[PDB]
Design an enzyme around this catalytic site. Structure first.
Site: not given
Ligand SMILES: O=C(Cc1ccc(F)cc1)NC(=O)Nc1ccc(Oc2ccnc3[nH]ccc23)c(F)c1
Length: 289
Positions: A154, A158-159, A172
């Site tokens: 994905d 947006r990711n 993601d």
């Molecule tokens: O992304 C992953 C697994 C992953 C990691 C790297 C990859 F390439 C593919 C998958 N884990 C997550 O939990 N993703 C994620 C992505 C964004 C998230 O929200 C935030 C995290 C830090 N700062 C933020 N500011 C606004 C939202 C936000 C969040 F809580 C979690």
């Protein structure tokens, strides 16, 4: 907690204690949340690293129950990032371990949130160089992941997260509009199909977050592509960069540039810019979903 956990899977979720952070070096602010989805309750948090030494972060919590299944996915979805140590890939700081319920997944906090929103914001003034640079960073993250045989599935603006130094971190949070033809036909994803997605990501960047193929029924984008179509060249997209997107969308998956060649090509194109070309939004794209 009233759930039998050691029924879990030692060899399956092996090493959740390898990246554990003692229920002390971390502080949660349950009153300030930033995550809203069918699942995912993320609140702002502060974790004092080493022995100084406050660090801002996003803590990932879960909702009570159900059985040992939701607990398994949540943890597994955290050990996914364990080894992901690259400046352009969103990493895991650790997982705090308390009882009475929910376990915690700690991520580095990202000041500017996701890439797509950052670029859509009318108060930001990106240049062609800025946008190409974000694209170069995504490619560096992907080259890392591909090196580890990790298929994203994905990849899209947006990711991707953007931090305080403007460092893009791949992350993601079906996306048929970013999917390669062969994957639309056979729901099979490979590194070569992430490249198709990267191309589309490059387009989102160059148009500053416009939705791809706004006019097409979303359903069958396959009949559309097979007619012999590709996204059009954005106004501010340099010819050479557009030739790269067209290469990322090659009909034959194997003829597509690897993420290493992409880093090489884009870094060249990027070096030629000085930051004197501002990028504006197309009137026909504004307010389009
Ligand atoms: O992304 C992953 C697994 C992953 C990691 C790297 C990859 F390439 C593919 C998958 N884990 C997550 O939990 N993703 C994620 C992505 C964004 C998230 O929200 C935030 C995290 C830090 N700062 C933020 N500011 C606004 C939202 C936000 C969040 F809580 C979690």
């Amino acid at each position: 907690v009233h759930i039998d956990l050691s029924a879990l899977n030692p060899e399956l979720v092996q090493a959740v204690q390898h990246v554990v952070i003692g229920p002390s070096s971390l502080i949660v602010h349950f009153n300030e949340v930033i995550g809203r989805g069918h699942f995912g309750c993320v609140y702002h948090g502060t974790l004092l690293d080493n022995d100084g030494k406050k660090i801002h972060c996003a803590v990932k919590s879960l909702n009570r129950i159900t059985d040992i299944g939701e607990v398994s996915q949540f943890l597994t979805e955290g050990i996914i990032m364990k080894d992901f140590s690259h400046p352009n890939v969103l990493s895991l700081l650790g997982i705090c371990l308390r009882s009475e319920g929910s376990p915690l997944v700690v991520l580095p906090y990202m000041k500017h949130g996701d890439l797509r929103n950052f670029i859509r914001n009318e108060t930001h003034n990106p240049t062609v160089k800025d946008l190409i640079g974000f694209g170069l960073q995504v490619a560096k993250g992907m080259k890392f992941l591909a090196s580890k045989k990790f298929v994203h599935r994905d990849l899209a603006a947006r990711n991707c997260m953007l931090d305080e130094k403007f460092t893009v971190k791949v992350a993601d949070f079906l996306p048929v509009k970013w999917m390669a033809l062969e994957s639309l036909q056979t729901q099979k994803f490979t590194t070569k199909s992430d490249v198709w997605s990267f191309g589309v990501l490059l387009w989102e960047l160059m148009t500053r977050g416009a939705p791809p193929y706004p006019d097409v029924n979303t359903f069958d984008i396959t009949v559309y592509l097979l007619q012999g179509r590709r996204l059009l060249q954005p106004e501010y997209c340099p010819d050479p960069l557009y030739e790269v997107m067209l290469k990322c969308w090659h009909p034959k998956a194997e003829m597509r540039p690897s993420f290493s060649e992409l880093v090489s090509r884009i870094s060249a194109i990027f070096s030629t810019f000085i930051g004197e070309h501002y990028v504006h939004v197309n009137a026909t794209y504004v307010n389009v979903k």
